[PDB]
């Protein structure tokens, strides 16, 4: 326990700070949200590990040059948190040492490798974190990175000269969707995904629908922006094309409400939950193609009347 009241109380102060970490585990472990609470735990973890790297400066083990109990506490914690993150210690080398030091005690090391030693779970089977029969698999680690990415989705929004606000930098989210969709397809090849698999099928249906609306929306954004140069601004051109400009403006109202409704949601994934979005955009792009096609018929019928116009472009 120590050689005196002082060294015994020193070892107990370490006990306290170690429990502020062993307990920190249990506080996020029972939650059904745990996979999303881990995020804030692993962010704080660095600041906590650091303090241990310092304690290990000018000392051989926690609480001194004669090895004390807190070092075996942190070793249990470490054993458990390395499963939660394999890279948690790499940023604190002096603790990675302290850890290997404990594990280096010949008798201890021989034990961990012995047959009576249980490789996993961490907690009682009932716990959310570290429960059940079998250690992760990675299937979990990847699916959690997917859900994390989709609750952080952000679109650069920039309004142009008139009313409507535009989405800049399409490709990045557009790419991410594709990549994460392909990841779920490769998860089907895995053996350990079977009932864990049902969830992925739900996430697959959510994202396949998100790429469905991703495709149509970029087309509308492009084709409207092109046609706005052509008819949205001048008086003279809209005078020549009456039914065309009256019908452009009617779609311009709809899309203005569709964007501002979708942008204020503040989650790109949340967009699939909006009523009739795939149907709306599919129909808008069809009408946008009819306007571009009608301009095309006018220009060529104009050109055919004074052939020179063929020269112009």
């Amino acid at each position: 326990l120590g050689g005196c009241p002082k060294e015994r109380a020193e070892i107990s102060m370490l006990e306290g700070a170690v429990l502020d970490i062993r307990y920190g585990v249990s506080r996020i472990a029972y939650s059904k949200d745990f996979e999303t609470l881990k995020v804030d735990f692993l962010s704080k973890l660095p600041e906590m590990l650091k303090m241990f790297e310092d304690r290990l400066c000018h000392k051989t083990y926690l609480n001194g040059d004669h090895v004390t109990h807190p070092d075996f506490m942190l070793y249990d914690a470490l054993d458990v948190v390395l499963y939660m993150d394999p890279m948690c210690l790499d940023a604190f080398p002096k603790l990675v040492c302290f850890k290997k030091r404990i594990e280096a005690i010949p008798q201890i090391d021989k034990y961990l490798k012995s047959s009576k030693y249980i490789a996993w779970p961490l907690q009682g089977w009932q716990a959310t974190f570290g429960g059940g029969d079998h250690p992760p698999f990675v299937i979990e680690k990847s699916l959690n990175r997917i859900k994390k990415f989709w609750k952080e989705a952000q679109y650069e929004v920039i309004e142009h000269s008139s009313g409507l606000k535009l989405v800049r930098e399409w490709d990045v989210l557009e790419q991410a969707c594709k990549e994460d969709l392909e990841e779920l397809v490769s998860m089907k090849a895995s053996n350990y995904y079977k009932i864990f698999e049902q969830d992925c099928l739900d996430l697959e249906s959510k994202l396949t629908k998100l790429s469905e609306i991703q495709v149509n929306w970029v087309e509308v954004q492009f084709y409207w922006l092109d046609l706005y140069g052509i008819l949205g601004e001048n008086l003279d051109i809209q005078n020549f094309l009456p039914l065309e400009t009256s019908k452009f403006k009617s779609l311009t109202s709809e899309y203005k409400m569709i964007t501002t409704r979708a942008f204020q949601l503040d989650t790109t994934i949340e967009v699939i939950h909006i009523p009739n979005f795939d149907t709306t955009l599919k129909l808008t792009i069809d009408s946008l193609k009819m306007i571009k096609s009608s301009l095309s018929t006018f220009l060529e019928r104009q050109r055919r009347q004074f052939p020179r116009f063929y020269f112009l472009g």
Binding site: V138, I139, S142, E179, E182, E183, S186, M187, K188, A189, S190, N191, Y193
Partner: protein, 79 residues
């Protein structure tokens, strides 16, 4: 043979060499890409085809490694 390996004694020995020893990655050279289908028939669903030239190569193989996919890389010249 059922997959569509040629009757030739040469091509039998070759397929033996490819399969039987895997302690090392095998490099299959064939002008007629009939061999890319042979391995596909053997592994079926598990068969994922990639190429050193395609863009998402870097990540797609990482998905292939994580969940036990059998991978064939279409352009071995470039590596």
């Amino acid at each position: 043979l059922e997959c569509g390996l040629d009757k030739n004694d040469y091509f039998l020995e070759n397929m033996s060499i490819v399969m039987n020893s895997q302690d090392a990655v095998p490099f299959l050279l064939d002008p007629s890409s009939h061999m890319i289908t042979v391995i596909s028939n053997y592994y079926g669903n598990k068969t994922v085809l990639l190429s050193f030239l395609e863009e998402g190569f870097v990540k797609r193989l990482e998905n292939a490694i994580r969940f036990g996919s059998v991978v064939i890389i279409q352009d071995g010249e470039f590596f």
